[PDB]
Amino acid sequence: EAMLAKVQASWAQTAARDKARYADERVPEDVHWETEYRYEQSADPQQTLNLYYPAKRRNATMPTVIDIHGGGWFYGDRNLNRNYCRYLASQGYAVMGMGYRLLPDVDLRGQIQDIFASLRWLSHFGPQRGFDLDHVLLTGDSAGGHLASLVACIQQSAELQELFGVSRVNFNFTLVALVCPVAEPSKLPEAADMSDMAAFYLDKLSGGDQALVDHLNFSQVVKGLDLPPFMLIGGQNDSFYLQSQALLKVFDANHVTYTTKLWPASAGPHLKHVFNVQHWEWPESIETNLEMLRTFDALSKQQDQAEEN
Known part of the structure; x- marks a missing residue:
């Protein structure tokens, strides 16, 4: 299929831009990482994760961040968001970032299984190496956010x-x-041709399983659950700002507790797609990322107080 090759051509371009950016970009200081842990009994190189820590740990355990990288469900691995994970870790957090098998080798169910396996690995092995799993920030960008x-x-x-x-x-x-x-990936085809391409993503995510079709969007899986608080980060110059708008509606209709950090157009044309993950060193990326960590800490302090701890 030349639809498949075309999608793959687009991610190869992305791969060369990501590679070029990484070669140039300043790397966060004062971080250690432990790389390439297999999180199941499998030689698939995508079923591995990296762990990141402040080089100097002020406690034996630190609050936990778990990152799910983006790349349109077809692209990426555990190293794609390394600078972003390193940055967050440098702020006094123990950070896990996992790979997951990519479409079309798998469908959504396979990706969700990979992420849960990584989480379960962390529940068994994280605390002995510095992860405080009583305070956990889950975050993801783009497809990772989905x-x-x-x-x-x-x-x-x-x-x-x-x-x-x-x-x-x-x-x-x-x-x-x-x-x-x-x-809300079902909204892709209707939104910002390419609709043929967007239907192709949808098919590869569902793998033809109608139960996945019916459970691919946050609006389908949110119903009736009491959820943790959410934080929605982005800006008007995000090429999928439409998705962020739509998600607020769904949060509102389901009584999801959320906060935002949405950058206005007037803040500039540089504040593009996942800028705060791709360019950790920019002042706006520092502001955004620290505001997320502070929100996380404020929640973790409330939890400690509620739990008489």
Whole structure:
């Protein structure tokens, strides 16, 4: 299929831009990482994760951040968001970022299983190496944000656990921060031709499974669940700003607690797609990322106080 090759041509371009940016960009200081952990009994190189820490740990355990990278469900691996993970870690957090098998090798169910496996690995092995799993920030960008939004709902729902073939992990999400998410992929074709291409993504995500078709969008998996708070991050110059707008409507209709950090057009044309993940060193990226971490900390302090701890 030349639809497949065309999609893959587009991600190869992205790959060369990401590679060029990384070669140039300043790297965050004062961070250690531990790389390439297999999170299941499998040689698939996508079923691996990296862990990141401040080089100097002021406690034996630190609050946890778990990152799900983006790339349109067809692209990326555990190293794509390394500078962003390093940055957050440098702020005093233990950070996990996982790979997941890519479309079309898998469908959505396979990707959700990978992320849950990574989470379960972390529940078994994280705390002995510095992860405090009582305070956990789940975050993801673009397709990563889609995936994080679904993971948050699945973790709360016995029904969805069964449908997706995973079990609950033995920890909760203190906050779920979505960075320019595409939380409503069914809305892609109608929105900003290319519709043929957008139907192709949708088919590869569903794998023809009608249960996945009916559970691909955050609006489908949100219903009836009491969820952690969400934080929605992005800006008017995000090419999928339409998705962010739509998601607010859904949050509002479902009584989801959320906060925002949405950059206005007047803040500039540089504040594009996932700018705060791709360019950690920019002043606006520092502001955004620290505001997310502070929100996370404010929630974690409230939790400690409620729990008489």
